[PDB]
């Protein structure tokens, strides 16, 4: 059975019992927001150019987008549909090759004609 050591499951991090594992989610956002503050604060130098500010705003936007989907943790759900010749959840797949090797199941009822078409005479099966 999996064991939890310090809020970190051995299932997700195998050697959770051996070392420092997992930063609390609140510390990952403190760093993120402090970084965003620094990145916004870079716009207060003496540089006359505006190419560098385009990069600053783009990177800040990417950071903000990241820090929001880390915060609200957006999730979705299983689609739960059926496509052409696809079976719903809870269907058992016959071993086709096993049914082909030994005449069972799917290949359990062939006409004598169908036996000879796959190169085996019906007199060989009883």
């Amino acid at each position: 059975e999996p064991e939890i050591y310090r809020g970190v499951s051995t299932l997700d991090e195998p050697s959770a019992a051996w070392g420092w594992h997992g930063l609390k989610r609140n510390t990952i956002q403190l760093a993120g927001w402090i970084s965003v503050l620094f990145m916004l604060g870079y716009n207060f130098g003496n540089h006359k150019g505006h190419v560098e500010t385009i990069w600053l705003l783009v990177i800040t936007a990417l950071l903000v987008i990241g820090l929001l989907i880390h915060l609200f943790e957006p999730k979705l759900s299983q689609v739960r549909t059926i496509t052409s010749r696809n079976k719903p959840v809870g269907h058992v797949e016959p071993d086709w090759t096993y049914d082909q090797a030994t005449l069972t199941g799917t290949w359990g009822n062939l006409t004598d004609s169908q036996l000879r078409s796959v190169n085996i005479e019906p007199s060989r099966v009883a």
């Binding site: 299983q78 689609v79 496509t83 010749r85 696809n86 079976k87 719903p88 809870g90 269907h91 086709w96």
Partner: peptide, 27 residues
């Protein structure tokens, strides 16, 4: 992106139905 982690589960080794290649004989 969505269908990679949330797409409908395939429960048959040939979802398209009438596949005729050795790849459609496996899980």
């Amino acid at each position: 992106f969505k269908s990679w982690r949330y797409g409908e589960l395939v429960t048959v080794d040939d979802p398209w139905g009438y596949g005729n290649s050795l790849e459609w004989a496996t899980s």
